[PDB]
């Protein structure tokens, strides 16, 4: 029922030791963001961006399940993360 997500770092952003995750379809981009920040032992003041298709940054209230159904491929959704903006 859950969906597979793969997280990839952009630029010099820290790399997650564990990249492939199974998440509830109802989890939002913000929920995903909060998880990574405390996983990388980052801080709230530090902003973190998430990207789909290496193209656009979905609103943080968007659900991963919808993004998967629309932009997923080969059984997973690829999301890129970065401490700074990458694609406008």
């Amino acid at each position: 029922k859950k969906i597979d997500i793969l997280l990839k770092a952009v630029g010099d952003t820290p790399i997650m030791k564990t990249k492939k995750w199974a998440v509830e379809r109802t989890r939002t981009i913000q929920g995903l963001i909060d998880f990574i920040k405390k996983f990388l032992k980052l801080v709230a003041s530090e902003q973190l961006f998430i990207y789909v298709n290496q193209s656009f940054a979905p609103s943080p209230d968007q659900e991963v399940g919808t993004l998967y159904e629309c932009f997923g491929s080969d059984g997973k959704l690829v999301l890129h993360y970065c401490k700074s903006q990458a694609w406008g």
Binding site: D4, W21, F35, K38
Partner: peptide, 13 residues
């Protein structure tokens, strides 16, 4: 093989 995020969050950061 994907790690369960719900498991980790409820296990111990």
């Amino acid at each position: 093989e994907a790690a369960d995020m719900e498991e980790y969050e409820e296990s111990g950061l």
